[PDB]
């Protein structure tokens, strides 16, 4: 409680999005993984570092 | 080739004014508190793997194949080796709060040498056992491309490569441990955020460069290994020295006796 | 014979001298001045 | 019984320590001085309410001054240069007492300033200190003494921890 | 990154972000380098570095003063506040 109770459940939730997103590079290519590789992974970290 | 030639030049030209840094102001209380000979040592051996860097540039001949890692292990196994002895040494002296111990001679200043000696005795045996058995050697190469030679040299041993690495790799893991034993050291005899960043910067670069050992074939190779090399090289040198190097020289006031007996007190 | 019964004779001082001065090696010695009524007294009590 | 040296013996924290108490020698103090030689501290006492006490009874002599050449001639001998020095000023209470009916400033010809102990207490204290010459490889250790708790011995302990401490790091050639 | 306030929370985000930025500049030499199947890890073992180390330096140390170490040591709003 001394620390923000929800800006800690959101970082945890970012950091899981961040993880999981690395799971679309590994496999063959498609069209619509090459289209959500990057995005993903950006926003999920710009969500943790702020 | 002649940018790294130039940056190995400079990494060469730090590494010499450092040791003369430390030649100039050895009463001082700061240089003092870290163990000076084995300062000594680590910035011979960080010259030595600075200048190995340069078997790496040139036309491949077969003498040349041979000298190109083992240079390299040795020389990085001997900084390890320093900075463990330099570590463990200072821990003995401040547990020992009893009056009387049997470990005097372990804290003797001819048996640092000794256990430095002992720790690279391993990788000076596996090298010459496989330069003895199965040689490295040069070859060419004309069926990755059909038009272009390249000139490259095959180890002849992977296993023998494998353990040069992984005794590297154990050292530098040893080498947190007794980073993390060492928090609670004083002033001026604490050095815990160095190590750890030290070991960190080598493994990053190294298990980085994985993907491209494994694909890339050419030139390059030769380039990638260079730039590990070195990064590896001055990333543990200005960890370890320049700190202490700017207190010594500006800011000056802090090397003065009444400063580390007040170190040293805040442990009791 | 003689030789034999001083050297063991020897061989037994000398084990009982070293134990005993390992056992004082681990002793702290202090020395305590002060001119009289300077309150020793109260420190040693 | 038996006069000389006084041999005290205790175990604090599982550390033995060995007190001898030579004040009724009542010689030479050169004779016996280097038979002491290899001690690891040295405990001093001094008694500040003797500022306004005429103890010695000579008016030339004030126990006060007759206490500083005893420090300065103990601190300063040949065989105890590498011995630390746990000095103990005693009585503080007498000593507040007494201060703002006669002031400090009886003992020393300087003004102590302000009549109460903690400005007294420093006075002395530095006065006491600036005797010692061989800063490099001794120091001295001041507590005030407390009856009532064991501050006393806690800062023996850790003053002798020190010394051993600072003992070992030189001889590595550390410190 | 000298306030002790909160476990010393400055130096463990100073850590970590440091982290990040040896973790990246390291990247470039490597991606030039790959050509082929191997384009593609070169990005995954960045992403999993960065995020292992962020994570880790903010919470490890909360988490063993919290469960699985003393409780009730350190616990107290005192500790949090100072
Ligand atoms: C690009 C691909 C690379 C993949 C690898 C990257 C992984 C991510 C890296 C790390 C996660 C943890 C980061 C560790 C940072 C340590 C923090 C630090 O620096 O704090 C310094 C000191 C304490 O602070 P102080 O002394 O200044 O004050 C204390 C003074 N007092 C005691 C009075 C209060 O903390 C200490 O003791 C230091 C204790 C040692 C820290 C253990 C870290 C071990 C990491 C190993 C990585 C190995 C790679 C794995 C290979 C597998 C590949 C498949
Ligand atoms: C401690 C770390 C120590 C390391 C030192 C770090 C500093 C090094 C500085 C520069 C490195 C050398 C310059 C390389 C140029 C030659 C490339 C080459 O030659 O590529 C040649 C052609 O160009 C290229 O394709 C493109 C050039 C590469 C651009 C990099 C894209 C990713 C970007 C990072 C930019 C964001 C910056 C943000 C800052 C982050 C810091 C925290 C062919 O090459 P290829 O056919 O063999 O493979 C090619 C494999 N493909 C195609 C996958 C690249
Ligand atoms: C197991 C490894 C590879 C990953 C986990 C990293 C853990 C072990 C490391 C990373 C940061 C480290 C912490 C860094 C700083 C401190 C503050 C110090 O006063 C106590 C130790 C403590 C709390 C360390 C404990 C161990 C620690 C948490
Ligand atoms: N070619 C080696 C580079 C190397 C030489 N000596 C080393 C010592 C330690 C680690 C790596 C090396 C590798 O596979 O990485």
């Avoid at chain 3, 070293?18 to 002060?34: F, I, P």
């Avoid at chain 4, 040295?42 to 001054?65: G, K, P, Q, T, W």
């Avoid at chain 4, 001041?142 to 708790?149: A, G, K, P, Q, Y």
């Amino acid at each position: 409680k001394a620390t923000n109770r929800e800006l800690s459940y959101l970082l945890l939730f970012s950091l899981l999005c961040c993880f999981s997103s690395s799971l679309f590079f590994i496999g063959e290519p498609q069209d619509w993984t090459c289209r959500l590789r990057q995005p993903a992974f950006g926003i999920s970290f710009v969500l943790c570092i702020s | 080739g002649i940018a790294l030639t130039l940056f190995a030049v400079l990494g060469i030209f730090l590494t010499a004014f450092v040791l003369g840094v430390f030649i100039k102001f050895r009463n001082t209380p700061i240089v003092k508190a870290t163990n000076r000979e084995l300062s000594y040592l680590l910035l011979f051996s960080l010259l030595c793997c600075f200048s190995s860097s340069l078997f790496f540039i040139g036309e491949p001949q077969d003498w040349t194949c041979r000298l190109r890692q083992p240079a390299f292990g040795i020389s990085f196994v001997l900084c390890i080796s320093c900075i463990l002895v330099k570590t463990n040494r200072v821990l003995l002296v401040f547990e020992a709060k009893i009056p009387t111990s049997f470990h005097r001679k372990w804290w003797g200043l001819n048996l640092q040498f000794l256990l430095v000696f002992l720790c690279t005795f391993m990788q000076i045996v596996i090298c010459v056992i496989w330069l003895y058995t199965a040689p490295p050697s040069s070859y060419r190469n004309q069926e990755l491309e059909d038009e272009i030679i390249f000139i490259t040299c095959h180890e002849g041993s992977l296993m023998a490569l494998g353990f040069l690495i992984g005794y590297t790799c154990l050292l530098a893991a040893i080498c947190f441990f007794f980073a993390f034993k060492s928090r609670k050291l004083p002033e001026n005899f604490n050095e815990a955020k160095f190590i750890t960043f030290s070991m960190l910067i080598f493994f990053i670069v190294w298990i980085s460069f994985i993907p491209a050992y494994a694909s890339t074939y050419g030139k390059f190779v030769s380039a990638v290994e260079v730039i590990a090399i070195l990064a590896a090289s001055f990333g543990l040198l200005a960890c370890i020295f320049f700190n202490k190097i700017y207190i010594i020289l500006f800011k000056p006031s802090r090397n003065t006796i009444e400063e580390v007996r007040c170190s040293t007190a805040a442990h009791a | 014979a003689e030789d034999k019964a001083a050297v063991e004779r020897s061989k037994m001082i000398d084990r009982n001298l070293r134990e005993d001065g390992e056992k004082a090696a681990k002793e702290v010695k202090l020395l305590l001045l002060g001119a009289g009524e300077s309150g020793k007294n109260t420190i040693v009590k | 019984k038996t006069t000389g040296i006084v041999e005290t013996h205790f175990t604090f924290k599982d550390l033995y320590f060995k007190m001898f108490d030579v004040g009724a020698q009542r010689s030479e103090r050169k004779k016996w001085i280097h038979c002491f030689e290899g001690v690891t501290a040295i405990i001093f006492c001094v008694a500040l309410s003797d500022y306004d006490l005429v103890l010695a009874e000579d008016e030339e002599m004030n126990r006060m001054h007759a206490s500083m050449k005893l420090f300065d001639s103990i601190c300063n001998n040949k065989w105890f240069t590498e011995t630390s020095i746990i000095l103990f000023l005693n009585k503080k209470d007498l000593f507040e007492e007494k201060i703002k009916r006669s002031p400090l400033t009886i003992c020393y010809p300087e003004y102590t300033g302000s009549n109460t102990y903690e400005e007294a207490a420093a006075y002395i204290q530095c006065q006491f200190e600036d005797l010692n010459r061989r800063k490099d490889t001794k120091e001295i250790y001041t507590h005030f003494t407390c009856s009532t708790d064991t501050k006393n011995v806690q800062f023996v302990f850790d003053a002798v921890t020190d010394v051993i401490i600072k003992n070992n790091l030189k001889e590595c050639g550390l410190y | 990154r000298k306030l002790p306030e909160n476990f010393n929370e400055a130096k463990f985000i100073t850590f970590s972000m440091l982290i990040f930025f040896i973790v990246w500049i390291s990247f470039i030499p490597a991606y030039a380098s790959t050509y082929g199947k191997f384009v593609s890890a070169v990005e995954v073992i960045a992403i999993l570095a960065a995020s292992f180390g962020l994570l880790a330096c903010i919470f490890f140390n909360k988490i063993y003063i919290i469960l699985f170490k003393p409780s009730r040591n350190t616990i107290e709003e005192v500790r949090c506040s100072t």
